[PDB]
């Protein structure tokens, strides 16, 4: 009869799930009355998000999805394409790539998609996207590979006018080639065409979340922008062709090793750095503990140093199956906890600002994958062998 994508879609759909997130966040307190002819310029607020995800490990119930959907989640629900409902928990997330991993709680008879090799993609190749555009459900749209970046973001015309960046990008064989994302951050929604992380990168970032707790991406800990910013002018910067350092992050390697706002990096390991962009991307091709010597500019300053795990990708209330923001520290040198909060449920448990945890409630916790591997097997007695540098206490 007539050609159709329905035959492979039937072998694919069981792997695509819907995701309903419920969570809260801090919003500013509304000042009243409200005057709409007056252009001006803390409380938790519940919000609801919804997106798609792809079953990537049928046994473990591992579902890949966008970080812009599950971010700040308190409750994450998943509904299979056959209608069965499950609960899910955060296992990992990485805001850079806008990719996150979750785990269906109590999976039973699941189907996982097969991942194809991103590296074999070519522009005229056919593409099919599957997502939940406006909430009304699971929509599939078709097209082709528009641009192969060459980070290799995949570009495709199988998008959706005014809709939210769905999820799965699949080839004509039903294999996963990329997860569609949203490059319009803290928004969701597209620029006109579609951007996907390639399947090979998805596989890679995803395994890290599993086997470590987070992705090994080191940060230079500087924060800044281009040489056009109001501050590059309001501070008049000499020789403009590089990355403007607006501030050096606290307790960072850039901070520790030496550097101060103003200097404009001009190179990284000999190579020219013409824009924060160039730099932000280059430092992203280097895993923790790496050493990268870069040239700065004040009069003619330059240094060499080693970076540590970034702070963007971190964990929260999913390490201890219970409930309560740690992350990994250097190589397999335990799990270092970061900025504690105000509610202080975890600080209340004797955990400060820089407390490592090499003791797996008794054993070795070189990382959050392991640590969490124990706070899931023996939920009975828990004594966190934490040692924030000196103090080696054992709280419950």
């Amino acid at each position: 009869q007539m050609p159709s994508l329905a035959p492979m879609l039937e072998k694919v759909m069981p792997s695509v799930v819907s995701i309903n997130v419920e969570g809260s966040t801090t919003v500013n307190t509304p000042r009243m009355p409200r005057n709409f002819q007056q252009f001006f310029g803390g409380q938790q607020q519940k919000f609801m998000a919804l997106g798609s995800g792809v079953i990537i490990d049928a046994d473990k119930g591992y579902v890949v999805t966008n970080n812009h959907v599950v971010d700040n989640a308190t409750v994450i629900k998943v509904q299979l394409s056959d209608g069965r409902k499950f609960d899910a928990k955060m296992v990992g997330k990485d805001p850079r790539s806008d990719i996150a991993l979750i785990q269906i709680q109590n999976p039973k008879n699941l189907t996982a998609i097969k991942m194809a090799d991103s590296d074999a993609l070519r522009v005229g190749d056919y593409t099919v996207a599957i997502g939940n555009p406006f909430g009304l459900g699971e929509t599939v749209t078709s097209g082709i590979v528009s641009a192969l970046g060459r980070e290799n973001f995949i570009q495709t015309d199988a998008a959706i006018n005014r809709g939210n960046s769905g999820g799965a990008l699949v080839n004509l064989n039903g294999e996963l080639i990329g997860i569609n994302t949203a490059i319009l951050a803290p928004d969701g929604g597209n620029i006109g065409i579609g951007f996907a992380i390639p399947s090979n990168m998805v596989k890679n970032l995803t395994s890290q979340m599993v086997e470590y707790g987070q992705v090994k991406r080191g940060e230079l800990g500087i924060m800044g922008t281009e040489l056009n910013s109001e501050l590059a002018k309001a501070m008049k910067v000499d020789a403009q062709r590089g990355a403007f350092v607006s501030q050096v992050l606290p307790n960072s390697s850039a901070a520790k090793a030496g550097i101060k706002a103003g200097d404009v990096i001009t190179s990284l390991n000999g190579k020219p750095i013409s824009s924060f962009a160039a730099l932000r991307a280059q430092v992203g091709t280097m895993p923790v503990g790496s050493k990268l010597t870069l040239g700065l500019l004040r009069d003619g300053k330059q240094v060499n140093v080693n970076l540590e795990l970034q702070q963007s990708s971190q964990n929260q209330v999913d390490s201890s199956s219970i409930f309560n923001e740690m992350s990994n520290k250097g190589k397999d040198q335990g799990v270092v906890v970061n900025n504690v909060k105000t509610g202080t449920p975890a600080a209340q448990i004797g955990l400060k600002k820089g407390d490592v945890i090499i003791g797996a409630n008794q054993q070795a916790v070189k990382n959050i994958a392991e640590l969490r591997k124990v706070l899931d097997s023996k939920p009975s007695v828990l004594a966190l062998n934490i040692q924030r540098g000196d103090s080696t206490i054992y709280l419950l």
Partner: protein, 346 residues
């Protein structure tokens, strides 16, 4: 009426009596609205280039019983004008934003109410120091600009306030810190284009929990267009405001977007029908109000001019606001109003 013109001094004594009645389901506006206005404009020739002037205008309500008096000063200022350079005046006057928004304030009775009086630099108010340049030193016909400063008008004196007081203090809805603003307009033949900006410090009394729209400063940005020729009058203005637009008695809007448009025609035999649309849309208001219409109405009316001294009019405010919690809380009128007026003026 010019009642004096001698040895280089001129005095114009002017005014009107408006016999006026409102019809409305809203009984707070319904009934007799009769009023009078009186004023004078004086000018004195100092030299061939320099003129001094003063103006005063006063409104006295004519709709009250004799055991009360409801009256106020609209404007009161003195100034100097120098030929082909500019003018300066100080007193109660109009804010420079009104240079642009006045262009749509031409309706028989209603209109001109996406803003109010004593409302930062948007309309009438106290303590305006105003500098104006007409025709750019007389080298560009039709191009005018203005820069204006407003001094603080704070808390009342003698009422136990321990900060923010001025001699002429008042309630917070009518206060202002120091402000600065500017306007530019260009008129070529019948056409007009204009823009204005104002920025006023907000006082501590205004930034309390008792009022929505807390903020450091009140800002307004206005664009306007006009056509005035061949017996046709068309004008529109759009204004974006920040912590500047009142939301009834609740306080101010965090942001508001105001739009006004008018169309009028003048028949030879004296009839001037008018059609207008006004709306004020508030955003991020606070207290769960979120986005709400502050004002929304279509105005249809007509004036009949018997001559330059006598006229009569009907104005029909078709009010598109719906009665809801927000408008109830703020005390915003949502009912239609019909006005009928008969006006003698000199």
């Amino acid at each position: 009426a010019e009642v004096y013109n001698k040895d280089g001094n001129k005095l114009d004594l002017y005014g009107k009596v408006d016999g006026l009645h409102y019809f409305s389901d809203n009984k707070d506006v319904d009934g007799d609205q009769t009023y009078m206005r009186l004023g004078f404009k004086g000018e004195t020739q100092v030299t061939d280039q320099l003129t001094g002037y003063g103006q005063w205008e006063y409104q006295i309500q004519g709709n009250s019983a004799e055991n009360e008096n409801n009256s106020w000063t609209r404007v009161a200022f003195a100034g100097l004008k120098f030929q082909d350079v500019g003018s300066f005046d100080y007193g109660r006057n109009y804010g420079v934003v009104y240079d642009v928004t006045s262009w749509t304030d031409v309706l028989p009775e209603f209109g001109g109410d996406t803003y109010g009086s004593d409302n930062f630099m948007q309309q009438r108010g106290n303590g305006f120091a105003t500098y104006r340049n007409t025709d750019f030193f007389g080298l560009v016909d039709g191009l005018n600009f203005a820069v204006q400063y407003q001094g603080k008008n704070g808390n009342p004196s003698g009422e136990g306030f321990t900060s923010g007081v001025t001699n002429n203090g008042r309630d917070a809805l009518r206060q202002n810190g120091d402000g600065v603003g500017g306007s530019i307009t260009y008129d070529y033949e019948g056409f007009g284009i204009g823009g204005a900006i104002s920025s006023s410090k907000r006082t501590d009394a205004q930034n309390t929990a008792a009022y929505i729209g807390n903020g450091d400063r009140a800002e307004t940005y206005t664009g306007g267009l006009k056509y005035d020729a061949n017996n046709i009058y068309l004008a529109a203005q759009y204004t974006q405001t920040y912590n500047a637009t009142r939301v009834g008695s609740l306080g101010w809007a965090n942001k508001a977007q105001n739009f006004e448009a008018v169309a009028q025609y003048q028949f030879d035999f004296g009839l001037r029908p008018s059609l207008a649309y006004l709306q004020s849309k508030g955003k991020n208001l606070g207290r769960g109000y979120d986005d709400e219409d502050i004002l929304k109405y279509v105005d249809v009316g007509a004036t009949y001019y018997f001559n330059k001294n006598m006229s009569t009019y009907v104005d029909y405010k078709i009010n598109l606001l719906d009665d809801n919690q927000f408008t109830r809380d703020a005390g915003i009128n949502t009912d239609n109003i019909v006005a009928l007026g008969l006006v003698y003026q000199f």
